[PDB]
Amino acid sequence: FDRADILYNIRQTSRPDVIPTQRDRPVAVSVSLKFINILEVNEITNEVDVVFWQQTTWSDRTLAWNSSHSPDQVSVPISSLWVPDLAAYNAISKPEVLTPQLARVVSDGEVLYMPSIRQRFSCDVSGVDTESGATCRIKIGSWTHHSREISVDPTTENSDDSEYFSQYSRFEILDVTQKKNSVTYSCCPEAYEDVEVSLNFRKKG
Amino acid sequence: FDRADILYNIRQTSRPDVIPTQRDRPVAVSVSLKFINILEVNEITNEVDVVFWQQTTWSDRTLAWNSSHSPDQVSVPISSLWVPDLAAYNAISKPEVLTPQLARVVSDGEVLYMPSIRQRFSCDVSGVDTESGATCRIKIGSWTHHSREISVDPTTENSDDSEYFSQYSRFEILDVTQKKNSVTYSCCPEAYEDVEVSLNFRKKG
Amino acid sequence: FDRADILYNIRQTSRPDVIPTQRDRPVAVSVSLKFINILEVNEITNEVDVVFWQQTTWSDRTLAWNSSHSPDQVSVPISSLWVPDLAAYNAISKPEVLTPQLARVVSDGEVLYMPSIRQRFSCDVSGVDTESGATCRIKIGSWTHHSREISVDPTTENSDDSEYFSQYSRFEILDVTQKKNSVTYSCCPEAYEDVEVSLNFRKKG
Amino acid sequence: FDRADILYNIRQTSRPDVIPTQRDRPVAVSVSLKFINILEVNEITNEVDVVFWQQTTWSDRTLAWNSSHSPDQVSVPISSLWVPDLAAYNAISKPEVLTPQLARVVSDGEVLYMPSIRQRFSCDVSGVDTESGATCRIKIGSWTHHSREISVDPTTENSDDSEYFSQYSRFEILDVTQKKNSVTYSCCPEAYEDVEVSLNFRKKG
Amino acid sequence: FDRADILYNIRQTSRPDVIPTQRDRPVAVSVSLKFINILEVNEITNEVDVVFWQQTTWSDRTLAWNSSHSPDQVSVPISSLWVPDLAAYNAISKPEVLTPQLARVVSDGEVLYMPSIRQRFSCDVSGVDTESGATCRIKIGSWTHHSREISVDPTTENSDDSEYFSQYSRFEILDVTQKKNSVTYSCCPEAYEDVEVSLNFRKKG
Ligand SMILES: [Ca+2]
Ligand SMILES: [Ca+2]
Ligand SMILES: [Ca+2]
Ligand SMILES: [Ca+2]
Ligand SMILES: [Ca+2]
Ligand SMILES: [Ca+2]
Ligand SMILES: [Ca+2]
Ligand SMILES: [Ca+2]
């Protein structure tokens, strides 16, 4: 089994429009933002222009294949796989994906998609130029799937919150924390899980 | 009918170019804007840059299926369904859809599409920085279908007009009301229904 | 015959790349701009940012269908029909079509396409802030078809020149007139008809 | 052989990805810019924002057909024909094609494509506000095909250099000249022909 | 076989989604940036707006043919070939490809793709207006493929670092050097090679 045979199968059998749900069991999607840069801040308008890696992970067993005597991983175009319909609730602009829209698929059906995104948000900027700085919270979760179909969860809290952050940034990061939530909206019957990421940063002293 | 079978049928049988009309009966489309944010205001030019959820709903019985022994709802791509050719009459820019273009389809043929849109409009801004504030009216309705084919109607007046509004917005909402209309234009023979939404807001005093 | 059957036929038999010409007879296309708004003016640079309805009409008999028992009209996507390759000669930016790109087709082969366009032009702005105001002329005609294939003609001079104009516009319209032309260019052998629309407006006083 | 039949053949037999080369003989492509307007100039940054007609012409005999009793020319979409991969070497932005992307095809296989393009360039602006003015040179030629496959050549020097120029332009044209070249680059083995157009203009006085 | 037969084969047999890997052997991709221009600099924000040729080269033997009596090179659209999923790690905007997205393929399976790109970056701008100037480093490597699949390497150090640079640029180039790297990220298990290009330039005097 070669990469050609592997990609060819996934391409020929995959269905991007169908969520890899197993029974009433929701699809476990883990989200993790890794800030790469903070470009524009406006404390007057409370708007931020930031860059980050939307490190996403989930499992699709219909993509699994035996790799004992074959490659364990392959790069698959996002368009040939089903992908979480995630959305940043307080995004003020659409995502400007800066990187190739390819995902990584492991023979066991594990999918890893980590695109670099530049996007504007509406959040609390007050305190940016302070020692305690500002705390901009960004909430992102499925747009059409509720908790019974899709569930989002945070990840790796170890990793230095700014090991990927640009050093030439006009700003600096104090701390980053992610706490998942589960909300029921008057608009909508069922509950919608989402990961809230709090970006505590400040202008470089 | 697993989710794959459901989506597969809709995809294979649907016709996005055909309005789900039953007899001389128009398609009942309900529109409801939920303001999420007001980004830029210019009282001199009377131009607004706002974000909102264009909560739309209508019914397409050709999408209905028996859900007695399967899911009741599925997420369908907008491109696989017929969608109302709505247009904001005083929109100054085209809609910047910020969210995944997926709709939600209920087994009974009910369709719910609620994209988050950022868009500019030409309306009355005078009074923005006033206690009574300004009242910006936005009218949206079908562009090519008259009242006999498509009819638009407002919805849920209860819901707090700003329960989804951003708190970090430079502005605040006093009140929001929607009143449907029915106009005949010299340009055009038949009548064209539309929902007029009045946004009474003001700068934070 | 119901809309599905109608749209289905047009879709299956139409050819967007073929001009509906009958013999050496040109296709009679009528153009009519209805100004909706004037957004930015610069008398120094003679540039205008305006919004208007490019009300276009022509006839394609290959789309005609018997309707003694069926609607005589349907909404057809622009991509499934042949459309006039019109261009605004003094357009400084490309057309930002603000509305659904659907056309209206009458059972007799009559086609009506009226998109709302925002676009910048290079024209005479001098006099904008004057009682007599400025006169910005915009010329639009087929880009590749000469008078023997396509002929453009103005229309309805009655209709109040500003019955669709925005009232919140920083400017106001004095008068609008359209006079068709027929030019032969040294560059090009045959003659190219075009409609010249003169927009006499001024800053509201 | 009406037009539908003509377009239908070209569409069904054409191959946009294949250069109409005859033997080791290159394809003779003639390029000719006709300036329509000069919109923004910055002598400090040496950047120009200009509009022009990229009048292009070449020959593709596989498109030829018997015009004995059938139309001689037809309008063909650019996407159904092979087109020169021209590029403006000092273009600072990509081409904003302002007109329908249709080409004109003559029964003998002659192809004429003249789109109106707005684009920014990096060139010599110094002297713009002078009697002798500035001379902005723009070089454009095939990006991937060398002299043995594609050869570019200038054209009609008669035509008044500003018979299509906008009169409301903040600037004026003194003279326009085009001189073809043939360069071999260290980067690249073979030689690459290109047409250099010198735009001598100045701010009006 | 003619140009047509060659392109036709590549088109009919190629697979853009499959990396041309031979055994556990990685694909050797060589990257080389040739700066064409530096458009905007901001020492305060450490952001650069630059234009360059992302001269890329690699080998895909499945594209090789017998040119022993046929043309040896052809221009192939990027969409019909597999292409390295390269990404500029500190790119602040996505690539604005200014040129035709065509690659050059040699009968031996060698592929050469050199698009002209305008793009913004986050790097060290301090010193721009200095004799020693600033050194802006840009790192680019595969986004999804590690060193075992894709390996990147610099190239030709001879070529005058500014023989393609614009002379009208507000800035000038002192020196350009490229040194490949190999990094293992806590985020990611395997190692990811990348080419680091250091642009030492300064404002003119
Ligand atoms: Ca194989
Ligand atoms: Ca942390
Ligand atoms: Ca099943
Ligand atoms: Ca209310
Ligand atoms: Ca009139
Ligand atoms: Ca000349
Ligand atoms: Ca052949
Ligand atoms: Ca060097």
Could you characterize the architecture of this molecule?
- Five copies of one chain form a homopentamer.
- With about 200 residues, chain A is mostly beta strands.
- Chain A has one domain (about 1-205): Neurotransmitter-gated ion-channel ligand-binding domain (Acetylcholine Binding Protein, Chain: A, Distorted Sandwich).
- Helices cover about 5% and strands about 50% of the residues of chain A.
- Chain A has one helix and twelve strands.
- Chain A has one helix at about 5-15, and strands spanning about 25-40, 45-60, 75, 85-90, 95, 100-105, 110-115, 115-120, 135-140, 150-155, 170-185, 190-205.
- In chain A, strands 1, 2, 3, 5, 6, 7, 8 and 10 form an eight-stranded mixed beta sheet that branches. A four-stranded antiparallel beta sheet of chain A has the order 4-9-12-11, with no helix packed on it.
- In chain A, β6 (about 100-105) and β7 form a beta hairpin.
- Bound molecules: calcium ion (8 copies).
- One calcium ion binds near residues 161, 175, 176 and 177 of chain B.
Proportion of helical residues of chain A? under 10%
The largest chain-to-chain contact, stated as pair and per-chain residue counts, equals:
D-E, 27 and 35 residues
Would you identify the CATH H-level superfamily of chain A?
A: Neurotransmitter-gated ion-channel ligand-binding domain
Radius of gyration of chain A: 19 Å
Beta-strand content bin of chain A: over 45%
CATH architecture term of chain A: Distorted Sandwich
Number of domains of chain A: 1
Number of strands of chain A: 12
CATH topology of chain A: Acetylcholine Binding Protein, Chain: A
Bound molecules: calcium ion
User: What is the helix/strand order of chain A?
Assistant: HEEEEEEEEEEEE
CATH class of chain A: Mainly Beta
Instruction: Name the assembly state.
Output: homopentamer
Class by alpha and beta content of chain A: mainly beta
PDB class: ligand binding protein
Keywords: pentamer, igg fold, ligand binding protein
Assembly: pentameric
Entry title: X-RAY structure of acetylcholine binding protein (achbp)
